[PDB]
């Protein structure tokens, strides 16, 4: 029957909770209370980036840390030159409803995918003057979210059908499928070292999956609702998670438990596109109250507010070198913020 | 003053050309009416799409009527959480909701009662607080033959009116309109469809014209 299996699963959950609680003598706040505070931050934006007429999801800069890929609901993919405010490429989209931006480590490919259940790879370095579709991937029964770029040939994606898929660029066939989530899967930041990846589902669960083995190894449940934001703390031993309520949680990888949560009584709206910095001191969260916030990922306290936006901030990202931070909202405006 | 480094002159000129193409595409899309198609089950969605298209994602319809390009999106092929992708369709010209009149007896709570909560969630949505909704009462011909044998008392326990189409349809429309709690800012255009005198496309055109007048009034000051 199934009653004994359910009882065994409950006992295993209790054992896992006991093991997690055993190694919880001290918290991050107690250790970090004896360090110098980050202090007030007055980061301001020096950019315009006015080329869109729809909601913006325009992150995943790239390794060169200057080019930008921008996807909106108008059905156009815009490649931005951040330094000079220039549009490099304007690729028409077959489907206007997309929520995905990727630039690939090589920079010669751009991934796009939304609720059309199609993932399109666009080749940038073509012998002609235009940008054409290099590979179309199908096999997902839900809206696409995140199109990370392991290599020039391997692309991992998440959809709303409670699964994740790794596809090959050369052959449009499935390679490795992860089926362990009970809800829609987004927030699939691709590690600092590309050998691993984690994904946050809609059932307040964040699960890590082996790229080669293709099996789940760790799960985290510390939220109370759907998760729509994941970073990976470029150190490689922790990752940040954001949910539809105004709270973020930092989960350690080796400890396998939530380290600390960042929340305030003055924030109630949602959270989208949580990303870290190149060192990890600053954690930037895109809230739904028409502005973004900066949190200290070490002690607890806030650091700054980025209020230079009109509509709800939907995407946020940082360059590889941490020179500047791109923020995009539904007001078809992209703001690039840099330190003083 | 920096001579713009020669090649960056051509780069910014290419940027201006891209901007020109972008604004041309935006102007073209601004004159395009976007309609959202919704339904509980079958709801006669296929029949309406097939009839009005000539007169696993989205089966988009780009039919034209009286120098107007209409966009229709069907999201019935997606089985996932609705609220995650429901904000992408905000700002549409109108939302088309189709409900079958012959669904007050069939189950899998009958189908129409299950459609009431979907209608409530769509009309009362925060993203759809300013978009007019066109309701279609499909299966009109089946209603005539399947109301005589099956009384309306099974569905509505608080109905005591005459067992006639002209009153039962009005009662169903009255409850469907009563599901709207934002009547002061939104309106519902209810229409009945049949396989004859196909004015459904004309009804959609009239509702689209009314909502365009509504929007232009907000843009042009008064209301």
């Amino acid at each position: 029957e199934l009653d004994q299996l359910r009882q065994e699963a409950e006992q295993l959950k209790n054992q896992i909770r006991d093991a997690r609680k055993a190694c919880a003598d001290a918290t991050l706040s107690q250790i970090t209370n004896n360090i110098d505070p980050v202090g007030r931050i007055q980061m301001r934006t020096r950019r315009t980036l006015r080329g869109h007429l729809a909601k913006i999801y325009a992150m995943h800069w790239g390794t060169d840390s200057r080019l930008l890929v921008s996807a909106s609901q108008d059905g156009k993919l815009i490649i931005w030159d951040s330094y000079t405010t220039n549009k490099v490429h304007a690729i028409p989209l077959r489907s206007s409803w997309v929520m995905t931006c990727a630039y690939a480590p090589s920079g010669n490919y751009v991934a796009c995918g939304g609720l059309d259940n199609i993932c399109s790879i666009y080749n940038l370095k073509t012998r002609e003057g235009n940008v054409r579709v290099s590979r179309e991937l199908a096999g997902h029964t839900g809206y696409l979210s995140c199109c990370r770029f392991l290599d020039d040939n391997q692309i991992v994606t998440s959809s709303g059908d409670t699964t994740c898929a790794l596809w090959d660029i050369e052959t449009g066939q499935q390679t490795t499928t992860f089926t362990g989530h009970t809800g829609d899967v987004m927030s699939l930041s691709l590690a600092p070292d590309t050998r691993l990846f984690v994904s946050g589902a809609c059932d307040a669960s964040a699960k890590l999956w082996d790229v080669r083995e293709g099996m789940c190894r760790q799960t985290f449940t510390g939220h109370e609702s759907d998760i729509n934001a994941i970073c990976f703390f470029p150190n490689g031993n922790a990752f940040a998670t954001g949910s539809d309520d105004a709270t973020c949680r930092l989960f350690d990888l080796r400890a396998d438990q939530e380290l600390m949560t960042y929340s305030h009584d003055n924030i109630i709206c949602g959270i989208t596109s949580v990303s870290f910095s190149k060192s990890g001191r600053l954690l930037l969260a895109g809230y739904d109250d028409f502005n973004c916030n900066v949190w200290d990922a070490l002690k607890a306290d806030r650091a700054g507010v980025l209020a230079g936006h009109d509509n709800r901030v939907s995407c946020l990202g940082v360059t590889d070198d941490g020179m500047a931070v791109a923020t995009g909202s539904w007001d078809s405006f992209l703001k690039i913020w840099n330190g003083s | 003053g920096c001579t713009l480094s020669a090649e960056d002159k051509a780069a910014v000129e290419r940027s201006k050309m891209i901007d020109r193409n972008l604004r041309e595409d935006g102007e073209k899309a601004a004159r395009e009416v976007k309609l959202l198609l919704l339904g509980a089950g079958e709801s006669g969605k296929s029949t309406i799409v097939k009839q009005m298209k000539i007169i696993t994602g989205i089966v988009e319809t780009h039919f034209t009527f009286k120098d107007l390009h209409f966009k229709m999106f069907d999201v019935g092929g997606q089985r996932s959480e609705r609220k995650k992708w429901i904000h992408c369709f905000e700002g549409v010209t109108a939302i088309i909701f189709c409900v079958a009149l012959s669904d007050y007896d069939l189950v899998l709570m009958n189908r129409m009662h299950e459609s009431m909560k979907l209608f409530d969630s769509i009309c009362n949505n925060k993203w759809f607080t300013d978009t007019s909704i066109i309701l279609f009462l499909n299966k009109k011909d089946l209603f005539e033959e399947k109301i005589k044998k099956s009384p309306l008392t099974i569905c509505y326990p608080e109905y005591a009116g005459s067992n006639t189409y002209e009153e039962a349809a009005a009662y169903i429309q009255c409850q469907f309109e009563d599901l709207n709690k934002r009547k002061d800012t939104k309106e519902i255009y209810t229409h009945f469809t049949c396989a004859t005198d196909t004015k459904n496309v004309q009804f959609v055109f009239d509702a689209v014209t009314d909502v365009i007048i509504k929007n232009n009034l907000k843009d042009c000051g008064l209301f």
Epitope: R66 | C2, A6, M17
Partner: single-chain antibody
Amino acid sequence: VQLVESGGGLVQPGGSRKLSCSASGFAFSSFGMHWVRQAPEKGLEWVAYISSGSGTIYYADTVKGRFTISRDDPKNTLFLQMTSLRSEDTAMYYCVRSIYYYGSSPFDFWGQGTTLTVSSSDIVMTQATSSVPVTPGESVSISCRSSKSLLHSNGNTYLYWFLQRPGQSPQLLIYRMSNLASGVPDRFSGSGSGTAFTLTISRLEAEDVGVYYCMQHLEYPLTFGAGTKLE
């Protein structure tokens, strides 16, 4: 991608003739076009250029106010019309394509060329060596000099290196003296600083001899080098 030109022949001085460069295999409307002339025995000489959409049109000093150029995207072709010709205009004309964005490769593809005969503050770019013997297997360095520092206040130099085989159209080898052109073997390399550039060929093989040309892109108004011949 293919560029084929027509309209050559022998023309009396003072006449008018037009050259048609028809493009087949790429996006002509998104590519700026240049016309570059080569004398039968002298070096390569710039003529004119027209941007995408006919926005910016430039002519060289010897040809300013006399020549005309035009484009038509639907027909995918380039016309250059020539009035009041002289005995100094007898040259092989090349129609070439160039695109201008971040990390682009202008002058990547050249045309086939047309033979035209007539019977009867600019930056100078000099090469110290005009001809040097070469052997299949040694490394050879070619030195390029400029009258002005090509390093602008943006972080990149505007060098271009072109190879002309004995009987083939010139092809780009390196651009901005920091990136290798597509389809070019890794043996070629370039380096140097403003006013003094070098190009190193290591593990030289056969079927690569020819004439090297050195191009600057600081201003418009681009001048070739003397041309280094290897044999």
